[PDB]
Write an enzyme that holds these catalytic residues in place. Structure first.
Site, PDB file in Angstrom:
ATOM      1  CB  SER A 122     -22.302  48.468 -70.213  1.00 34.18           C
ATOM      2  OG  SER A 122     -23.085  49.269 -71.226  1.00 34.18           O
ATOM      3  CB  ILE A 160     -32.465  48.815 -68.717  1.00 35.43           C
ATOM      4  CG1 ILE A 160     -31.307  47.607 -68.918  1.00 35.43           C
ATOM      5  CG2 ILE A 160     -33.567  48.601 -67.986  1.00 35.43           C
ATOM      6  CD1 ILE A 160     -31.717  46.236 -69.715  1.00 35.43           C
ATOM      7  CE  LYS A 172     -20.853  49.122 -65.891  1.00 42.17           C
ATOM      8  NZ  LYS A 172     -21.099  48.058 -64.922  1.00 42.17           N
ATOM      9  CE1 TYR A 200     -21.728  52.425 -66.631  1.00 41.60           C
ATOM     10  CE2 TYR A 200     -21.954  52.174 -68.934  1.00 41.60           C
ATOM     11  CZ  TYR A 200     -22.283  51.805 -67.808  1.00 41.60           C
ATOM     12  OH  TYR A 200     -23.021  50.929 -67.467  1.00 41.60           O
ATOM     13  CB  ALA A 201     -16.089  53.782 -72.489  1.00 46.37           C
TER      14      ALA A 201
HETATM   15  N1  LIG Z   1     -29.601  50.423 -66.661  1.00 41.51           N
HETATM   16  C1  LIG Z   1     -29.010  50.327 -67.798  1.00 41.51           C
HETATM   17  O1  LIG Z   1     -29.557  50.824 -68.962  1.00 41.51           O
HETATM   18  C2  LIG Z   1     -27.809  49.624 -68.197  1.00 41.51           C
HETATM   19  C3  LIG Z   1     -27.139  49.298 -69.245  1.00 41.51           C
HETATM   20  C4  LIG Z   1     -25.976  48.555 -69.203  1.00 41.51           C
HETATM   21  C5  LIG Z   1     -25.492  48.220 -68.152  1.00 41.51           C
HETATM   22  N2  LIG Z   1     -25.853  48.517 -66.855  1.00 41.51           N
HETATM   23  C6  LIG Z   1     -25.240  48.226 -65.628  1.00 41.51           C
HETATM   24  O2  LIG Z   1     -25.935  47.110 -64.980  1.00 41.51           O
HETATM   25  C7  LIG Z   1     -25.740  47.090 -63.365  1.00 41.51           C
HETATM   26  C8  LIG Z   1     -27.063  47.497 -62.870  1.00 41.51           C
HETATM   27  O3  LIG Z   1     -27.568  48.584 -63.159  1.00 41.51           O
HETATM   28  P1  LIG Z   1     -29.062  49.385 -62.852  1.00 41.51           P
HETATM   29  O4  LIG Z   1     -29.526  49.915 -64.212  1.00 41.51           O
HETATM   30  O5  LIG Z   1     -29.794  48.319 -61.749  1.00 41.51           O
HETATM   31  O6  LIG Z   1     -28.424  50.641 -61.819  1.00 41.51           O
HETATM   32  P2  LIG Z   1     -29.338  51.365 -60.797  1.00 41.51           P
HETATM   33  O7  LIG Z   1     -28.761  52.867 -60.534  1.00 41.51           O
HETATM   34  O8  LIG Z   1     -30.705  51.203 -60.935  1.00 41.51           O
HETATM   35  O9  LIG Z   1     -28.534  50.510 -59.429  1.00 41.51           O
HETATM   36  C9  LIG Z   1     -27.171  50.572 -59.189  1.00 41.51           C
HETATM   37  C10 LIG Z   1     -27.317  50.294 -57.667  1.00 41.51           C
HETATM   38  O10 LIG Z   1     -26.096  50.141 -57.089  1.00 41.51           O
HETATM   39  C11 LIG Z   1     -25.830  50.542 -55.893  1.00 41.51           C
HETATM   40  N3  LIG Z   1     -24.384  51.168 -55.526  1.00 41.51           N
HETATM   41  C12 LIG Z   1     -24.112  52.362 -56.147  1.00 41.51           C
HETATM   42  N4  LIG Z   1     -22.922  52.478 -55.268  1.00 41.51           N
HETATM   43  C13 LIG Z   1     -22.610  51.499 -54.610  1.00 41.51           C
HETATM   44  C14 LIG Z   1     -21.604  51.059 -53.630  1.00 41.51           C
HETATM   45  N5  LIG Z   1     -20.736  51.822 -53.423  1.00 41.51           N
HETATM   46  N6  LIG Z   1     -21.766  50.032 -53.209  1.00 41.51           N
HETATM   47  C15 LIG Z   1     -22.785  49.147 -53.256  1.00 41.51           C
HETATM   48  N7  LIG Z   1     -23.748  49.573 -53.985  1.00 41.51           N
HETATM   49  C16 LIG Z   1     -23.623  50.538 -54.486  1.00 41.51           C
HETATM   50  C17 LIG Z   1     -26.910  51.814 -55.873  1.00 41.51           C
HETATM   51  O11 LIG Z   1     -27.471  51.857 -54.605  1.00 41.51           O
HETATM   52  C18 LIG Z   1     -28.057  50.962 -56.732  1.00 41.51           C
HETATM   53  O12 LIG Z   1     -28.823  50.288 -55.941  1.00 41.51           O
HETATM   54  C19 LIG Z   1     -24.628  48.267 -63.383  1.00 41.51           C
HETATM   55  O13 LIG Z   1     -23.492  47.823 -63.180  1.00 41.51           O
HETATM   56  C20 LIG Z   1     -24.996  49.026 -64.530  1.00 41.51           C
HETATM   57  O14 LIG Z   1     -23.711  49.768 -65.032  1.00 41.51           O
HETATM   58  C21 LIG Z   1     -27.272  49.192 -66.736  1.00 41.51           C
END
Ligand SMILES: NC(=O)c1ccc[n+]([C@@H]2O[C@H](COP(=O)([O-])OP(=O)(O)OC[C@H]3O[C@@H](n4cnc5c(N)ncnc54)[C@H](O)[C@@H]3O)[C@@H](O)[C@H]2O)c1
Ligand SMILES: NC(=O)c1ccc[n+]([C@@H]2O[C@H](COP(=O)([O-])OP(=O)(O)OC[C@H]3O[C@@H](n4cnc5c(N)ncnc54)[C@H](O)[C@@H]3O)[C@@H](O)[C@H]2O)c1
Lengths: 254, 255
Positions: free
Chosen positions: A148, A199, A170, A166-167
């Site tokens: 992130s 996102i 990540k 989270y910081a």
């Molecule tokens: N969306 C953003 O703005 C953003 C920005 C930077 C980083 N990210 C990172 O990108 C990755 C995907 O994020 P996203 O935006 O698609 O999130 P989201 O919340 O849409 O999806 C996360 C998915 O992880 C699954 N999950 C949660 N706990 C779980 C577990 N114990 N076992 C298996 N699966 C599990 C959830 O069911 C969900 O389907 C993550 O690592 C998030 O930290 C997202």
């Protein structure tokens, strides 16, 4: 001397067709986009997620396994089944991640530990089972972790809230990427990381405006903005790239 | 004698680059020539700016060599006027030209120091400045790709040899210039990124190569072809949301 130049046209299908992609968190916003993108280039995709996928892909090359990556018993059983069926992943994508939104001073141990377990333990566990399997099989697999911008920069509390854990987690995933890249390199295994910027999902336009102000490219990201880097880091295009964190954030963290 | 060559082209990249004009400084060198050949194979038009003639006859009317010195503003100015006059406005600028010097720090002369600065820093600055001004005026959403080095991020180990202080200075400067211009040029839709190669196998001694490979997790020195994927990534729509980044392609060397 007569030099004959031949142009062999290839597609990302040529890179990925019939390869096997294991993706944790594949039901989520970013994960679903990656699942759809890999399926469209003829890859096989296994999604590990406690949540059912958002769409019916209607594809014999897609498999959803309802699983919790914080649970070693469940993951162990899955990897036994994978090995028994000779479904040896070519690519592991550790996409699963979570966060929590109350202030630092109110953080509970339950909140803190849950984010650690999904983000840190889950990436460790899947990487450990996958590394051991690939080592046994001699497979030159590729791992892609998800960081992130907030594992590199620090979130501005005034923009809203991203929590301390989270910081922490990540930043830990980014450094674990470097650690496992050096550790797994003698086996021919590559390990890299993508750190998305914000996102567009379900954020108030108060936050969006503040976020876009800090983003040079002047907009929030979409899942489709990450696919090129994901394909780059999991294909032969990046054979000599390992241990790297790739920020896809419109310049947010400059 | 007949010699057959096979170039694997990615349709995404052929479709992407066929209408693109790439301006590459230092395109006659080891890395530059590989980049020229690769862009030509995906149907791009390529202009090489280099004082040295290419060592290969590409036999392509989509290739042009301009004998030029990127440290000379008058030369570059006249070239950019001619490019505009001829409707050869680049879509992609690759600042690949770079040099070094190999005597010890305590023996560095100002002439050596200044020559490395002028090619590495002034040259990237000057070509970026003429290209930025032209794109801003034409409304072109161009892409710039600079060339750093592992030694602008890590520090050379002199027990493996000769890599000098000024190379570290100027490559760090190019990496940070990439971030600066990325932020500066973003309102005009212009992206700016950097690739920092690890060491590339060429004419080093066998002792050097052994010492280098020992520091490299992937267990080998680089080849120019190892860089093409990231070059294509950062100059194509696959990286539309990527700007200001330095991409190390070094087999894990900096780890
Ligand atoms: N969306 C953003 O703005 C953003 C920005 C930077 C980083 N990210 C990172 O990108 C990755 C995907 O994020 P996203 O935006 O698609 O999130 P989201 O919340 O849409 O999806 C996360 C998915 O992880 C699954 N999950 C949660 N706990 C779980 C577990 N114990 N076992 C298996 N699966 C599990 C959830 O069911 C969900 O389907 C993550 O690592 C998030 O930290 C997202
Ligand atoms: N080769 C490596 O091991 C390595 C490693 C890391 C980074 N790099 C960087 O990659 C880039 C290319 O390196 P290479 O190994 O192909 O180098 P090279 O010495 O083979 O080529 C450099 C080219 O730059 C050109 N050049 C020199 N002065 C110039 C000037 N004033 N104006 C225009 N062109 C000029 C030269 O004529 C030559 O064709 C350089 O920036 C270098 O610092 C190289």
């Amino acid at each position: 001397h007569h030099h004959h130049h031949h142009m062999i046209l290839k597609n990302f299908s040529d890179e990925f067709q019939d390869k096997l992609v294991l993706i944790t968190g594949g039901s989520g916003q970013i994960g679903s986009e990656l699942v759809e993108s890999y399926l469209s280039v003829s890859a096989r995709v296994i999604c590990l997620d406690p949540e059912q996928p958002s769409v019916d892909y209607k594809s014999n090359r897609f498999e959803w396994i309802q699983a919790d990556i914080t649970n070693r018993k469940e993951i162990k059983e899955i990897f036994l089944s994978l090995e028994n069926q000779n479904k040896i992943p070519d690519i592991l994508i550790n996409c699963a991640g979570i966060s929590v939104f109350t202030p630092f001073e109110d953080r509970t141990d339950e909140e803190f530990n849950e984010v650690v377990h999904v983000n840190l333990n889950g990436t460790f566990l899947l990487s450990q089972y996958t590394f051991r399997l690939w080592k046994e099989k001699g497979k030159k697999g590729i791992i892609l972790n998800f960081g992130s911008i907030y594992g590199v920069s620090i979130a501005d509390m005034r923009i809203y809230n991203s929590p301390e854990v989270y910081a922490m987690t990540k930043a830990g995933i980014i450094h674990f990427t470097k650690y496992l890249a050096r550790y797994a390199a003698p086996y021919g295994i590559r390990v890299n990381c993508i750190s998305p910027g914000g996102i567009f999902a379900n954020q108030s336009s108060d936050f969006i405006q503040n976020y876009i102000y800090k983003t040079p490219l002047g907009r929030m990201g979409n899942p489709s903005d990450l696919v090129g880097g994901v394909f780059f880091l999991t294909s032969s295009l990046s054979e000599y790239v390992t241990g790297q964190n790739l920020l896809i954030d419109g310049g947010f963290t400059i």
